[PDB]
């Protein structure tokens, strides 16, 4: 069982840390990686039911289980905030263009 899924792809709860750690790093430290610059504020224009504080920053989660550092995002978010507290897993699967719909 997936403990978040994207579409096709399956997310276990580890899959989901390994990830947030990354992109939280990344963010204190002022740096970013890949060509669109990642982690950026997400922004929620789509009015999410995010039980954690506002701003939140969107880094990419990647099926094959490693870790983004450069080159394809692909379709999956994990949104993280300020404190370090998970939002969401998001995804621009089954979505209209670069719109996005929560993991189930
Ligand atoms: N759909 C959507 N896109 C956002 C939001 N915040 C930032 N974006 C980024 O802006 C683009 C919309 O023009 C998206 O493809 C997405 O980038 P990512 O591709 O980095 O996920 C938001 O809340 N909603
Ligand atoms: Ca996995």
């Known amino acids: 069982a997936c403990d978040y899924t994207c579409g096709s792809n399956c997310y276990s709860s580890s899959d989901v840390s390994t990830a947030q750690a990354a ?3 990344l963010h204190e430290d002022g740096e970013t990686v890949g060509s669109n610059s990642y982690p950026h504020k997400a922004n929620n224009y789509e009015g999410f039911a995010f039980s954690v504080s ?4 969107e880094w990419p ?3 094959s289980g490693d870790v983004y ?3 394809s995002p692909g379709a999956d978010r994990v949104v993280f905030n300020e404190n370090n507290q998970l939002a969401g897993v998001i995804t621009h699967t089954g979505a209209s263009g670069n719109n996005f ?3 189930t």
């Open 54 to 57: 506002s701003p939140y920053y």
């Open 61 to 63: 989660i990647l099926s």
């Open 23 to 25: 992109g939280y790093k």
């Open 101 to 103: 719909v929560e993991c």
């Open 69 to 71: 550092s450069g080159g």
